[PDB]
Paper text:
Parechoviruses, including *Parechovirus A* that infects humans as well as *Parechovirus B* (formerly Ljungan virus) and *Parechovirus C* (formerly Sebokele virus) that infect rodents, belong to a group of picornaviruses whose 2A proteins, instead of being proteases, contain a conserved H-box and NC-motif and are homologous to a small cellular lipid-modifying enzyme (PLAAT3) that acts as a host factor, enabling the picornavirus life cycle. Despite the common evolutionary origin, 2A^H/NC^ proteins and PLAAT3 have no conserved function, as the active site of the viral proteins cannot support catalysis. Our structural analysis has shown that the topological rearrangement first observed in HPeV1 and leading to the apparent destruction of the active site configuration of the enzyme is indeed a general feature of *Parechovirus* 2A proteins.
To see whether this destroyed active site is also preserved in other species of the genus *Parechovirus*, we decided to expand our structural characterization to members of the *Parechovirus B* species. The final model included 103 water molecules, however, due to missing electron density, the C-terminal residues 130-135 in chain A and residues 123-135 in chain B as well as the C-terminal hexahistidine-tag could not be modeled. In *Parechovirus B* 2A_2_, the stretch of amino acids corresponding to the C-terminal α5 helix in *Parechovirus A* and *C* 2A proteins, is either at least partially disordered (LV1-2A_2_) or had been truncated to obtain diffraction quality crystals (LV4-2A_2_).
Numbering used by the authors:
A (entry chain B): 1 to 122
B (entry chain A): -1 to 70, 73 to 129
Amino acid sequence: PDIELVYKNRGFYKHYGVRFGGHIYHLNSQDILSTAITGKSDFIKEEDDGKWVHAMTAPLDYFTEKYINSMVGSKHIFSATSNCETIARDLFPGRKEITQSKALGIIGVILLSASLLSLLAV
Amino acid sequence: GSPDIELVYKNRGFYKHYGVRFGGHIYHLNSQDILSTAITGKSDFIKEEDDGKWVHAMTAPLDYFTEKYINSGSKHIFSATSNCETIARDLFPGRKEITQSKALGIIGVILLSASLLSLLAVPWDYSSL
């Protein structure tokens, strides 16, 4: 099953999330600039409030090929509370090898990457 | 067939400032800070003689870079002086349909995108594209 990227407009950028069923997985971030420099983010799993905008639905491998272009990976440190312990099964169902830590890293870099590039859409 | 494009960079610590190396010169953006540049939404191109301090990132066909970075709405405006009037012939040889404006737009989005995404990369990973 595909990944659905969604966003909320935050004026000078878009804040992205992954919609799965009735929830959105996204980062607790006051703003992308601060987040990018500080190098750490906490994940939230929140009920869909109906105010997210559809961005794109595509296979996970479309997004990982585009943004996870390194078997070395990110400097960014991702954490999550236990309500995110569904993320591996939800977003990587077929993939037994994906631990929660790996899942957060992959999804987190996708969301941060999308948010950073949204700076160019003015 | 056309030569591959050589992406190079200078490390700025928190991110990498990328350029395209062709012969003895580097095409890159006049930018003190990548996030500042992205917010401003406009930048000027520079063509500079290679000072020997650029780091090799990746050599690849143009369409490797365009598939990765142009296949995802930039409204950034790229300008150049006549010092960049070689950019189309240098980086898009024998493609008459690539005007100067188009060449700046394509190379600009690649450099801005690579630079922005390097904010998330470990800073020593040269091949982080």
